[PDB]
Amino acid sequence: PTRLTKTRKHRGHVSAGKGRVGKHRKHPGGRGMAGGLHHHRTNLDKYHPGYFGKVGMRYFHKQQAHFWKPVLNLDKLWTLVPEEKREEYLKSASKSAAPVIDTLAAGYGKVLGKGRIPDVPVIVKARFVSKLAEEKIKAAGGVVELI
Amino acid sequence: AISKNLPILKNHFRKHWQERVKVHFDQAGKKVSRRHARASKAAKIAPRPLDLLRPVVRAPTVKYNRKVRAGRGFTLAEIKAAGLTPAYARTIGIAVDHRRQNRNQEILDLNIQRLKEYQSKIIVFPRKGKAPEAEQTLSAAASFPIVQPVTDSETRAVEDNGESAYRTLRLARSDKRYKGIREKRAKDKAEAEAEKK
RNA sequence: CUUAGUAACGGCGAGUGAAGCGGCAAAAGCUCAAAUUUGAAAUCUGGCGUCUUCGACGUCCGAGUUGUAAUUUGAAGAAGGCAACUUUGUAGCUGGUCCUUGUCUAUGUUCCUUGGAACAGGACGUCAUAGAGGGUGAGAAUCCCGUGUGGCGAGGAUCCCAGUUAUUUGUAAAGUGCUUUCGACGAGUCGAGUUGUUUGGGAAUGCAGCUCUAAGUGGGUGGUAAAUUCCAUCUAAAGCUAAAUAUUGGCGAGAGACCGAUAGCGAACAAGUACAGUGAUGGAAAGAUGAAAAGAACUUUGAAAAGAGAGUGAAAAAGUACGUGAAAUUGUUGAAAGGGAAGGGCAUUUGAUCAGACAUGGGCCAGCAUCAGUUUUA
RNA sequence: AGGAUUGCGACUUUUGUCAAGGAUGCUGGCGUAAUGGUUAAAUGCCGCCCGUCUUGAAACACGGACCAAGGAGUCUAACGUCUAUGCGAGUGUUUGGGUGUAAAACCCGUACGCGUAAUGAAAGUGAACGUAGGUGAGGGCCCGCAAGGGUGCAUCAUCGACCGAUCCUGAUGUCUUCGGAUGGAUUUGAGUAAGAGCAUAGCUGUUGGGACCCGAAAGAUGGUGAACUAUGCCUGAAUA
RNA sequence: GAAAGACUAAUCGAACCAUCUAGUAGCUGGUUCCUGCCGAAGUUUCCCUCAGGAUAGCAGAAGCUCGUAUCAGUUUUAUG
RNA sequence: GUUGCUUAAUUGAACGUGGACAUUUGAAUGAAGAGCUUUUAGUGGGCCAUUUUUGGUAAGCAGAACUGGCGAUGCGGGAU
RNA sequence: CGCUCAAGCGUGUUACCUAUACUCCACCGUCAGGGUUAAUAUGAUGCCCUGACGAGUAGGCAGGCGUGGAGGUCAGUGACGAAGCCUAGGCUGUAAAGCUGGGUAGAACGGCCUCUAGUGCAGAUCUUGGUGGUAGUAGCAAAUAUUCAAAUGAGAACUUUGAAGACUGAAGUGGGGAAAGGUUCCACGUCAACAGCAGUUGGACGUGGGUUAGUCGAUCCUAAGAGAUGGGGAAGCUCC
RNA sequence: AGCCAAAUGCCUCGUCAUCUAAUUAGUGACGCGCAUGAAUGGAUUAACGAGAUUCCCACUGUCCCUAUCUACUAUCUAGCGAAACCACAGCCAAGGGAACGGGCUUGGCAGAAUCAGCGGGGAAAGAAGACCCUGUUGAGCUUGACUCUAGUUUGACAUU
RNA sequence: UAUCGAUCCUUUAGGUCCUCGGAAUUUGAGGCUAGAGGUGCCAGAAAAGUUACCACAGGGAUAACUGGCUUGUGGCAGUC
RNA sequence: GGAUUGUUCACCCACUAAUAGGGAACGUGAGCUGGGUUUAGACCGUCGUGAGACAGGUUAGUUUUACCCUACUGAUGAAU
RNA sequence: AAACUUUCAACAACGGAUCUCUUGGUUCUCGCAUCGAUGAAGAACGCAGCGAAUUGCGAUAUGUAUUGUGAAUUGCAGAUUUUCGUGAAUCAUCAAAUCUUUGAACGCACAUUGCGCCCUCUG
């Protein structure tokens, strides 16, 4: 919409929202991040920090593939099991018939502790696990199989 | 040049970018060219499908090893296992790949079943006289789909034995870090200096 | 399409910046050198002759043994022995298919008003798998060309398919089970040092010059320089190949919430033209009478151009200095004012000119009295 | 001014009356250029020429003889706050495929982006002592005739708990040098504590782009000129 | 160039013609319709900063949680 | 009451449990609603007056302090 | 201007003049605080009540007026006259503007709800095109010089013939060529423009006619120079 | 060695002599000469000079001191017919004001339309100051400024 | 109450530490935590002249000429 | 009235009644002149390694347009 | 009082804005692959009954032959009768020919319509 803008409304006045003294010239400061250490230090000391310099060490030929491992909290856990088979499983599984939850098929690396799960045997399969995550599962009844 | 409280952007437009711009106006028209091309090819070929029959293959890396996918060609070992030559297979609508190898009994069986299912369902016309035509099925992928292998038992026993999965990972990882120096510490003390004794 | 404005690069400042996997479009694979046909250079150019002439057959010189055919290419493969055999090929004729084309296939010009002219308005119909667009004296489905639906020819391309007819390939060409011996693989190259250049490539990504110069379980790579020991992966230093992808040039077709003659290409017109420069080059302006030229016969004034009349036409307030014909700027007539400028604002007066509910039966302008609100003066 | 009545009152023996929440009554003239409207001149008083840079312009500061048409914050790639819309721990059909009355409209789903977890340079590890904790304030609701008591979301302040880094402590065990139990610390993070985001569209602001419009002295690449004039060579001519 | 920075097609202290090129400018000039409401600054710190920017201050808009609060460019008593 | 602080201590110090005292919410005056958050414009050459005041013989000169004006502002008066 | 026991100077006591300031009333807008469809026609965005305030450059936000195209809708208007243009006619709005009478003219164009932009000009020593004052003015003065009749013609200071005066004075206003131009040479017709006065004349305009070589030139030879080939450079255009 | 207040001397119009009635000039001597001087050439010098400077003779409207004449313009008429410039225009004095008004303020005043002249004003026209300063804008020339480079020269390896 | 210094680079101290991404061992290089090598234009570029042959963009924010304010100085006149 | 100097100022020789001092955009360049300062040619000295510099000296060097308005000097002239 | 100056209106000038029109532009999509020593692209000079330019063609010169359609061309002439046809036409079509002098340009030269050499027929 060209009619709703403010340049339509400025037709008549001389400066067009830019002042008589300042003038609106081409490039008064510079051209993109120019004079970061000299005359735009007060901007970069505020608001940003840590901009100049270099922390850490280099990685040559890095791949976003070795570093995968998407986490999964124990709050979610039961969402991997279907909705039909839930009111059935929550009321009486009681060993020798526990619902197997393969996390890697859904797309999760490390089973990880946060929530407080109900007292039912689970038998979970996962690549990695936290120390707390195992304590909560054994308190319920189940176990953790590695892959 | 800078200064409010905005994120530092990275816009790479300091070359003559306007001279090398493309706008895809052809998207709609180019779709009809491909649908026309796929249709006109089927008219020339007539009773055969447009696609070659491809095998089932497992994917690489840690990110994608948990899924199966349609490969390139059937290998020379699997083509032999069914009961046919590689030169003959290329003219029946079966893709061959001379460089892929087999190090898995599970994938070896699956693709032998895939060839036997293919050979049974297709018919072949002779070179000489009669040719009893039976329409055309276009997509080979439709009739021969790719299904994910099931390694599942929904309800199952709970066999615990006080091992702790977390403790197993910490011990196993420590062995990889220290087997280098632990071999060399054993090559001294017990060997070299004490084999001299 | 994602990876990613990421891993790296950079007076680590400004700024620069890939690729693997994953999802799709499209998929097609292959050939030489290095082995002795050695019980028969088996191969090929040209000349001369004859035929069904993009060729085929026969014959005579030449090329070539310092290597032309057949045979084999690392996925293999060859030479022997044992063993079962499943396959075959080359012309033209007609038809379809694909192009270039030509022709055929519905329905009112009925009545009345306006007009120079119906293609306008009103009344009554007709056709519709045709109410896209254009033409005709003003907005036409039905006046004309077309459009829609489907027929019917002609002339090329021909192997893409289908169906036939000759042939006549064969004792030769191909494929596969077992077992024994072998299994030829590209050099001033690979690789190393050094200089210059380039990349995201960091003790050096590729390329090039110069000096050094290999190997046979060998050589290359595995993104930090070395020495030592393993593992995983391919086989360089010779070569061919459709498709998905590009396209401000050329030849042929469609469209547009684009411009409407100071716009849009420099150019809607005899435009790269007229014209300028020694020369490389530079480079304009300029569209519209009327439906039809019916483009003004004839008289009279004038040396003539033209003028007055007349005449054409719906109109000459359309006369080829032509549709409409604004402003600056000028002439004539009318009204007003004017003692070193004019031109404005508030308020009257005079002069000009102009809207607005006294019409049915035949509002405008003031004055006095008693009150309310605000004040003033004795 | 207003446009039925409603109110406060006063005077009334009473009904009623009234100067009491804003003007009614009676009369005359004319009914049209008379009153008003615009327009031109005259008379009284007042009035410097606009636009612009500037502490300051009528300026002896700059641009402006006059008229017509043209003529200047636009579009895009990444973005920030606010606002509307749809779905909501999810969200996004449109690279591509299927269809079609054909660039439209309609339908389809693997992936993939962002979000659901952080902190470290990295190796890595990875969020409940307790009603997801107490204290002070808190809208609203609940009990009560009230006084007051109960329950207290959002949010603000404040002291604790939990996860990561940092610095100490170093239990049972054990390839005798690995392993890290438990307990701590004037340290420290863009964390957890009954999730809020993703997509489209709009005004305003940002950075790259010709970047609101016109304006240099320069620099670089590839070409054309000795008919003027500078100098040498070859061949001619001219000077009482 | 018998020397004046002379002449080199009216062009010379570095010719002319096209292209890169819409070269860059902290500097000059311009920047197109009405009413309505609010209404500034020329000051602090840093800068090859002094005809210029960043940063705070002043201004507008959008509002959110509440509803007489613990407030005031002021006075008084006490006390520095 | 609370403790690993502190005490010769059964003391102290912080944060508390329950309890007593609301006309007289413990000076005056006013209150135009109070508190708070995000975002972005222009500006960053200033100048004059009354007192205080430094340099200078002095200046319609230069440079500070406290309020008020002009700049951004017409209107009545100072003839202008 | 003029003023002298003031119309001067110092002081006192009254009246009177007067700002967009102050008080009161009418109307406009903005902001706040209320009341109301309880069937009760017409806009709940409605219809009322009460109170305060109004200057403003740079700047910000709000509500409207107009221009060119796109989707919808008034079965809108129109050759019985659409658009445009002119008008000391009229009506509405604070205004941007809109509606309408009279004239001119001869084919298309409006309102209301939305979409969209190459969307509004007085200035830029702005760009292109046109026209003024200045002004019937500056001026049309160097190369010694013209005069009298006759003819043609509508028309003669300027053309053709006669007569008289003059000049260049043979290093010339004479007779021929080179470079360069290209029909300007020559005849017949004829004056719209050009010949800065005029025009019957013309190097103008219209239509034709005209350049004859064995011996004059070019052609042929070489000059200062230029320039293939055989060769050698250079990625190459090409260089020696 | 020479030469001089010299085209080289600041203090200066140097001091002495001569030319004139009178000379910041001219010529001749003097010289601790701001800062003369020997092929970055010193001193002298016949002829020559559209070179610079002083005086004398003759000559004259340069001057005391202006006057007169001739042609061609201007002037008037017939015909033909432009440009620069221009916000709007054109009477003065004082005041205040961006400190020197043609317009504002207070006085003087003020009469159609016009023609020759003229240079007092219009801070009159000409050209986005060339002098001066500023710009983080340039170019020409110079050099022990900073970083390079063709050419040349020395050494090593190849040609061997 | 004064006596001094970022990024990047080099360097030293410290730890039974982390990394060289096909797997190991030793050298080597790269990281994590604190010092030193200096920017005096001291919130920190690496930098010599000249133009009278000159150029462009601007400036009365700023000199050389008048005019105005001022009168030390110059000039003229009083007082005891 | 004259000598010298581009001069303002200065210093002399005479005459004379006397040879007083000043202003008017430091009056007066579309009124003249161009000796001076003040561009480019060139020479000398001091200074500079050099290009060049010198409030040192010396010589050669471009002075445009009125026809308009007012002003002044003269000259006609409608209407009582 | 006129003339003269200034403002307005009607008619007439000057000039070409405004309004309506449009065989041209600009962008986007879709299809196809074809220049030349058999002499190309470009250049000069010619050709019509009456043409200067533009449009066509090359001394066979606004074209010839071949095929299709079936009566024109038109500013003014003029035919031809070809008009129940092996045929009008500035028509469409296009497969046989012509193609001046040049140009990559080719006998050697080329500010020249310059100068040679070989085979062959006729004077």
mmCIF file of C-alpha atoms (C1' of nucleotides) in Angstrom, chain H:
data_model
loop_
_atom_site.group_PDB
_atom_site.id
_atom_site.type_symbol
_atom_site.label_atom_id
_atom_site.label_comp_id
_atom_site.label_asym_id
_atom_site.label_seq_id
_atom_site.Cartn_x
_atom_site.Cartn_y
_atom_site.Cartn_z
ATOM 1 C "C1'" A H 1 94.466 40.033 -8.379
ATOM 2 C "C1'" G H 2 90.496 42.948 -9.375
ATOM 3 C "C1'" C H 3 85.459 45.964 -9.090
ATOM 4 C "C1'" C H 4 81.252 49.073 -5.971
ATOM 5 C "C1'" A H 5 75.875 52.451 -2.179
ATOM 6 C "C1'" A H 6 77.078 48.851 -9.242
ATOM 7 C "C1'" A H 7 70.490 45.382 -12.370
ATOM 8 C "C1'" U H 8 74.349 43.028 -6.119
ATOM 9 C "C1'" G H 9 74.468 48.364 0.350
ATOM 10 C "C1'" C H 10 69.471 46.886 4.992
ATOM 11 C "C1'" C H 11 70.821 51.816 8.326
ATOM 12 C "C1'" U H 12 69.862 56.172 3.461
ATOM 13 C "C1'" C H 13 67.432 60.905 0.337
ATOM 14 C "C1'" G H 14 75.335 57.756 2.771
ATOM 15 C "C1'" U H 15 79.822 61.762 3.002
ATOM 16 C "C1'" C H 16 82.869 64.924 -0.483
ATOM 17 C "C1'" A H 17 83.026 67.061 -5.710
ATOM 18 C "C1'" U H 18 80.329 68.430 -10.191
ATOM 19 C "C1'" C H 19 75.806 69.542 -13.391
ATOM 20 C "C1'" U H 20 70.733 73.431 -11.867
ATOM 21 C "C1'" A H 21 68.088 79.569 -9.509
ATOM 22 C "C1'" A H 22 66.599 74.986 -6.753
ATOM 23 C "C1'" U H 23 68.158 67.833 -8.114
ATOM 24 C "C1'" U H 24 65.194 61.046 -3.043
ATOM 25 C "C1'" A H 25 67.717 61.593 -10.133
ATOM 26 C "C1'" G H 26 72.763 61.682 -13.466
ATOM 27 C "C1'" U H 27 78.214 61.306 -13.576
ATOM 28 C "C1'" G H 28 83.207 61.162 -10.836
ATOM 29 C "C1'" A H 29 85.872 59.580 -6.266
ATOM 30 C "C1'" C H 30 85.741 57.146 -0.999
ATOM 31 C "C1'" G H 31 84.833 51.743 0.998
ATOM 32 C "C1'" C H 32 85.325 46.518 7.916
ATOM 33 C "C1'" G H 33 81.345 45.605 1.502
ATOM 34 C "C1'" C H 34 73.664 43.780 6.273
ATOM 35 C "C1'" A H 35 74.963 39.808 1.913
ATOM 36 C "C1'" U H 36 81.261 42.080 -4.212
ATOM 37 C "C1'" G H 37 85.061 38.551 -6.291
ATOM 38 C "C1'" A H 38 87.607 35.079 -10.351
ATOM 39 C "C1'" A H 39 85.120 29.296 -16.657
ATOM 40 C "C1'" U H 40 78.587 28.616 -10.543
ATOM 41 C "C1'" G H 41 83.981 32.986 -14.701
ATOM 42 C "C1'" G H 42 86.545 38.580 -12.605
ATOM 43 C "C1'" A H 43 88.234 43.302 -14.925
ATOM 44 C "C1'" U H 44 88.510 45.996 -19.842
ATOM 45 C "C1'" U H 45 86.491 46.900 -24.694
ATOM 46 C "C1'" A H 46 86.134 48.815 -31.146
ATOM 47 C "C1'" A H 47 81.619 47.842 -33.994
ATOM 48 C "C1'" C H 48 76.313 46.576 -33.538
ATOM 49 C "C1'" G H 49 70.984 47.359 -30.512
ATOM 50 C "C1'" A H 50 62.399 48.663 -32.443
ATOM 51 C "C1'" G H 51 67.426 46.946 -25.062
ATOM 52 C "C1'" A H 52 67.493 50.427 -19.962
ATOM 53 C "C1'" U H 53 69.049 55.580 -18.176
ATOM 54 C "C1'" U H 54 70.916 61.305 -17.757
ATOM 55 C "C1'" C H 55 72.082 65.831 -20.090
ATOM 56 C "C1'" C H 56 72.923 69.395 -24.392
ATOM 57 C "C1'" C H 57 71.656 71.539 -29.667
ATOM 58 C "C1'" A H 58 67.722 72.231 -33.257
ATOM 59 C "C1'" C H 59 62.324 71.575 -33.430
ATOM 60 C "C1'" U H 60 57.546 72.122 -32.216
ATOM 61 C "C1'" G H 61 49.734 73.444 -29.758
ATOM 62 C "C1'" U H 62 53.011 68.684 -24.705
ATOM 63 C "C1'" C H 63 51.966 73.374 -22.070
ATOM 64 C "C1'" C H 64 50.698 79.135 -20.691
ATOM 65 C "C1'" C H 65 45.234 79.228 -23.388
ATOM 66 C "C1'" U H 66 42.698 77.996 -26.305
ATOM 67 C "C1'" A H 67 40.528 79.280 -31.389
ATOM 68 C "C1'" U H 68 39.111 77.919 -36.613
ATOM 69 C "C1'" C H 69 38.440 74.729 -41.007
ATOM 70 C "C1'" U H 70 37.213 69.848 -43.982
ATOM 71 C "C1'" A H 71 35.124 64.951 -44.823
ATOM 72 C "C1'" C H 72 32.353 60.630 -42.376
ATOM 73 C "C1'" U H 73 28.889 59.812 -38.127
ATOM 74 C "C1'" A H 74 25.325 61.489 -34.581
ATOM 75 C "C1'" U H 75 20.645 64.429 -35.838
ATOM 76 C "C1'" C H 76 15.438 64.207 -39.330
ATOM 77 C "C1'" U H 77 12.920 61.097 -43.086
ATOM 78 C "C1'" A H 78 11.780 56.179 -46.528
ATOM 79 C "C1'" G H 79 12.739 50.936 -46.148
ATOM 80 C "C1'" C H 80 14.774 46.912 -43.206
ATOM 81 C "C1'" G H 81 15.360 45.675 -37.954
ATOM 82 C "C1'" A H 82 18.528 42.994 -33.419
ATOM 83 C "C1'" A H 83 21.081 41.955 -28.224
ATOM 84 C "C1'" A H 84 22.592 42.508 -23.041
ATOM 85 C "C1'" C H 85 19.471 42.925 -18.806
ATOM 86 C "C1'" C H 86 14.655 42.421 -16.084
ATOM 87 C "C1'" A H 87 11.248 39.757 -8.015
ATOM 88 C "C1'" C H 88 8.202 44.392 -8.287
ATOM 89 C "C1'" A H 89 9.352 49.288 -9.685
ATOM 90 C "C1'" G H 90 11.796 54.095 -10.126
ATOM 91 C "C1'" C H 91 11.599 62.185 -6.029
ATOM 92 C "C1'" C H 92 14.510 63.677 -1.446
ATOM 93 C "C1'" A H 93 16.334 64.622 4.293
ATOM 94 C "C1'" A H 94 16.829 62.300 9.155
ATOM 95 C "C1'" G H 95 15.750 58.070 12.252
ATOM 96 C "C1'" G H 96 16.095 53.100 13.674
ATOM 97 C "C1'" G H 97 17.732 48.525 11.251
ATOM 98 C "C1'" A H 98 22.284 42.606 9.314
ATOM 99 C "C1'" A H 99 25.652 49.175 12.173
ATOM 100 C "C1'" C H 100 25.583 53.385 4.100
ATOM 101 C "C1'" G H 101 16.671 52.359 2.186
ATOM 102 C "C1'" G H 102 13.515 53.128 -4.158
ATOM 103 C "C1'" G H 103 9.485 50.646 -0.533
ATOM 104 C "C1'" C H 104 8.930 50.586 6.809
ATOM 105 C "C1'" U H 105 8.692 55.756 10.805
ATOM 106 C "C1'" U H 106 8.349 61.411 11.111
ATOM 107 C "C1'" G H 107 8.718 65.676 7.986
ATOM 108 C "C1'" G H 108 9.628 67.989 2.832
ATOM 109 C "C1'" C H 109 6.162 67.624 -0.877
ATOM 110 C "C1'" A H 110 3.292 66.265 -5.414
ATOM 111 C "C1'" G H 111 0.148 67.683 -12.294
ATOM 112 C "C1'" A H 112 -0.891 64.538 -18.815
ATOM 113 C "C1'" A H 113 2.577 63.075 -22.763
ATOM 114 C "C1'" U H 114 7.679 63.786 -24.566
ATOM 115 C "C1'" C H 115 12.873 64.899 -27.599
ATOM 116 C "C1'" A H 116 18.374 65.891 -27.643
ATOM 117 C "C1'" G H 117 22.516 65.394 -24.424
ATOM 118 C "C1'" C H 118 25.132 63.203 -19.989
ATOM 119 C "C1'" G H 119 27.832 59.880 -17.088
ATOM 120 C "C1'" G H 120 26.069 61.524 -9.905
ATOM 121 C "C1'" G H 121 23.289 57.040 -8.244
ATOM 122 C "C1'" G H 122 20.639 52.282 -9.393
ATOM 123 C "C1'" A H 123 26.235 49.081 -3.440
ATOM 124 C "C1'" A H 124 24.452 49.031 -12.832
ATOM 125 C "C1'" A H 125 25.917 44.639 -16.329
ATOM 126 C "C1'" G H 126 29.657 41.151 -17.146
ATOM 127 C "C1'" A H 127 32.286 35.263 -14.465
ATOM 128 C "C1'" A H 128 29.022 29.643 -8.321
ATOM 129 C "C1'" G H 129 36.684 35.012 -6.050
ATOM 130 C "C1'" A H 130 42.062 33.687 -9.045
ATOM 131 C "C1'" C H 131 43.847 36.714 -3.093
ATOM 132 C "C1'" C H 132 42.846 34.359 2.142
ATOM 133 C "C1'" C H 133 41.213 30.041 5.353
ATOM 134 C "C1'" U H 134 38.566 25.175 5.547
ATOM 135 C "C1'" G H 135 38.086 20.047 3.184
ATOM 136 C "C1'" U H 136 40.843 13.780 6.454
ATOM 137 C "C1'" U H 137 39.223 16.589 -2.443
ATOM 138 C "C1'" G H 138 43.246 16.568 -6.371
ATOM 139 C "C1'" A H 139 47.267 17.251 -9.734
ATOM 140 C "C1'" G H 140 52.712 19.270 -11.542
ATOM 141 C "C1'" C H 141 57.756 19.288 -9.808
ATOM 142 C "C1'" U H 142 61.928 17.809 -5.665
ATOM 143 C "C1'" U H 143 64.420 14.801 -2.096
ATOM 144 C "C1'" G H 144 68.690 10.127 2.814
ATOM 145 C "C1'" A H 145 60.045 11.110 3.692
ATOM 146 C "C1'" C H 146 57.465 5.651 3.756
ATOM 147 C "C1'" U H 147 56.807 0.988 0.614
ATOM 148 C "C1'" C H 148 58.130 -0.707 -4.351
ATOM 149 C "C1'" U H 149 60.232 -1.214 -9.537
ATOM 150 C "C1'" A H 150 62.442 -1.711 -15.195
ATOM 151 C "C1'" G H 151 67.613 -1.746 -16.117
ATOM 152 C "C1'" U H 152 72.409 -3.309 -14.471
ATOM 153 C "C1'" U H 153 75.929 -6.072 -11.496
ATOM 154 C "C1'" U H 154 77.877 -10.146 -8.262
ATOM 155 C "C1'" G H 155 77.271 -15.520 -6.729
ATOM 156 C "C1'" A H 156 74.990 -20.631 -7.026
ATOM 157 C "C1'" C H 157 72.566 -24.654 -10.085
ATOM 158 C "C1'" A H 158 71.357 -26.192 -15.233
ATOM 159 C "C1'" U H 159 73.058 -25.863 -20.755
ATOM 160 C "C1'" U H 160 78.249 -29.282 -19.945
#
